[PDB]
Amino acid sequence: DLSLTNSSLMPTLNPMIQQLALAIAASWQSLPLKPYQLPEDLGYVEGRLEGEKLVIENRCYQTPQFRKMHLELAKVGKGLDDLHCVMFPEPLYGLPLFGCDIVAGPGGVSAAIADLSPTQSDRQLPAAYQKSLAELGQPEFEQQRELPPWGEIFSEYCLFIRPSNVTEEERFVQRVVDFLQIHCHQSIVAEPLSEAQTLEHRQGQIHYCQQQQKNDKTRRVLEKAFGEAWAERYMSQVLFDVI
Ligand SMILES: C=CC1=C(C)/C(=C/c2[nH]c(Cc3[nH]c(/C=C4\NC(=O)C(C)=C4C=C)c(C)c3CCC(=O)O)c(CCC(=O)O)c2C)NC1=O
């Protein structure tokens, strides 16, 4: 399932989304993957109420270091495209949370967000991450976006932009590839932590999922195609499940 060649959505998504989906899949392809079963063994889902149809493709995996690796592609009607990805770490290893959300319409990408988010109580990334991320240097983008109020969960390296041209699209993709290369290497060298530290990282992941559920822009997309009760179950059990 991890080849995207069987995807029905891929050919119709915004090109930046296609490039990022491919890069994520390439990063995961040779890991010690096992399937992760979403609620009701959800793969493909389509729904419509009174407006536009929402189509969603889900792929989910797990490894010893990552309890849940979720790649979701979505399209609303013919306008709105979305790529959503979260690698949820196993708290035992103390790794940060990789996440990204890319939203596009007919006139281009409106929102591109990626981060390696902290799970420590002091809201800092592990020292090895800080060092590696600082060495990449700060990227220059013309149109930055300020994080909403629930976005206190994001690191100081969080990127949130509207890409202004294809060069910036490519620059953002390359920065996400760099984040993934750092993250995959740190996962090899990570050691199992003490019970007390595992608990702190668990709490940090819970908090991340609770704050992400406050994103009303995501919720309203789901609500308009499936209704309020479906949307709440999807947000809380599929996208941002509390462990
Ligand atoms: C069904 C799945 C799914 C859909 C439909 C979705 C849609 C979605 N996500 C966002 C913004 C959107 N997404 C995020 C961030 C994230 N969101 C995440 O799922 C993750 C992992 C991050 C961060 C790593 C932020 C911070 C914002 C801006 C929220 C705002 O402007 O209020 C928008 C508003 C775009 C804009 O303002 O230009 C939409 C429609 N996101 C999804 O995940």
Ligand 1 pocket check for 213: Cβ under 6 Å = no
Ligand 1 pocket check for 197: Cβ under 6 Å = no
How far, in Å, from the CA of 81 to the mean position of ligand 1? Answer: 11
Task: Give the Å distances, CA to CA, from 73 to 76, 108, 118, 240.
Answer: 11, 16, 25, 16
Ligand 1 pocket check for 177: Cβ under 6 Å = no
The resolution, in angstroms to one decimal, equals: 1.9
How far, in Å, from the CA of 7 to the mean position of ligand 1? Answer: 22
Q: How many whole angstroms separate alpha carbon 80 and alpha carbon 106?
A: 7
How far, in Å, from the CA of 85 to the mean position of ligand 1? Answer: 11
Q: Whose CA is nearest to atom 9 of ligand 1?
A: 218
Ligand 1 pocket check for 82: Cβ under 6 Å = yes
| Experimental technique used to determine this entry | X-ray
Per-position DSSP letters for the chain, written without gaps between them: --SGGG-SSGGGS-HHHHHHHHHHHHHHTTS--EE---GGG--EEEE-SSS--EEEEEEEEE-SSEEEEEEEEEEETTTEEEEEEEEEEPGGG---EEEEEEEEETTEEEEEEEEEE--STT----HHHHHHHHHH-PPP-S-B----GGGGGS-TT-EEE---SHHHHHHHHHHHHHHHHHHHHHHHH--PPPHHHHHHHHHHHHHHHHHHTT-HHHHHHHHHHH-HHHHHHIIIIIIS---
Ligand 1 pocket check for 45: Cβ under 6 Å = no
